[PDB]
Amino acid sequence: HHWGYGKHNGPEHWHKDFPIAKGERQSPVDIDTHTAKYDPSLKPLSVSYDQATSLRILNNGHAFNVEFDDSQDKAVLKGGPLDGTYRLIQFHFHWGSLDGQGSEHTVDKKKYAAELHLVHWNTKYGDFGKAVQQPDGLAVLGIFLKVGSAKPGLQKVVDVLDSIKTKGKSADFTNFDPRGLLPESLDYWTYPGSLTTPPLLECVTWIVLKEPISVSSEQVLKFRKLNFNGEGEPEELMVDNWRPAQPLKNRQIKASFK
Numbered sequence: 001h002h003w004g005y006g007k008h009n010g011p012e013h014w015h016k017d018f019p020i021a022k023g024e025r026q027s028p029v030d031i032d033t034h035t036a037k038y039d040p041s042l043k044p045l046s047v048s049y050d051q052a053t054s055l056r057i058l059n060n061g062h063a064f065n066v067e068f069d070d071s072q073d074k075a076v077l078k079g080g081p082l083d084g085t086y087r088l089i090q091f092h093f094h095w096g097s098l099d100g101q102g103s104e105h106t107v108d109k110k111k112y113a114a115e116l117h118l119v120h121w122n123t124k125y126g127d128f129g130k131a132v133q134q135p136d137g138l139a140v141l142g143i144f145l146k147v148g149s150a151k152p153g154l155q156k157v158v159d160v161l162d163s164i165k166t167k168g169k170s171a172d173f174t175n176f177d178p179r180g181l182l183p184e185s186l187d188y189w190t191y192p193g194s195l196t197t198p199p200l201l202e203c204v205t206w207i208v209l210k211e212p213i214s215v216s217s218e219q220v221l222k223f224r225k226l227n228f229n230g231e232g233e234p235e236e237l238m239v240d241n242w243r244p245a246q247p248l249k250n251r252q253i254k255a256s257f258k
């Protein structure tokens, strides 16, 4: 016990330990596609994951993280709305108990079955732990998942999940290529916001891709077999680990495309 997604420690409770839950730049938000302004001055996003080095995959009791070696400039995000260079540290997903829900961002109130977060930290702050303390410390690239055809490049991730079923298990996870998770287009919306889990730090430039990837019902079924609890504790399925949309307040969502 600590924060979680249940009725007693879920998102509606987070504020009591992390008062910034109710701040002015919280995530996720609903993306009102008609209100987002086209911005012709935005650069194309630059995703260079050519030399990415995955190390490990971890169940942390909230989701699973695939972690990358971020000790050199190997997998970087740049361009788009970003000044400077951000390094890939980890990716994880948020998903639902049913296909009808699971994403954190919504697009005109539409919920996707899941959402991928590729998390990068601003190289000028030297590490992740320092970047999160800064208003432009992180750039998270969000990609929606819908259920239809399998994504072949996600299969290696779904196959290792049996080995990390419960909170705290980890496993070796080398030579995973994150480029196999990206849709065709790099069209995106961008707005300033926060971590979507405690400590909810307001340190993120959110880059949310317009085009979802499609994954198979069998692939997302396997996410749903993971556990929130630790090994030899009562079984709580890891499902519905998403924060709902937070008020937009004084913020504009820009679009890279018309």
Ligand SMILES: NS(=O)(=O)c1cccs1
Residues within 6 Å of the ligand: 001, 002, 003, 004, 008, 009, 010, 013, 014, 015, 016, 017, 018
């Ligand atoms: N605010 S909280 O979700 O971190 C919490 C911890 C214990 C009960 S509720």
Ligand SMILES: NS(=O)(=O)c1cccs1
Residues within 6 Å of the ligand: 117, 119, 140, 194, 195, 196, 197
């Ligand atoms: N879900 S998220 O991408 O906003 C995040 C939380 C903590 C590190 S990255």
Ligand SMILES: [Zn+2]
Residues within 6 Å of the ligand: 092, 093, 094, 117, 196
């Ligand atoms: Zn996330």
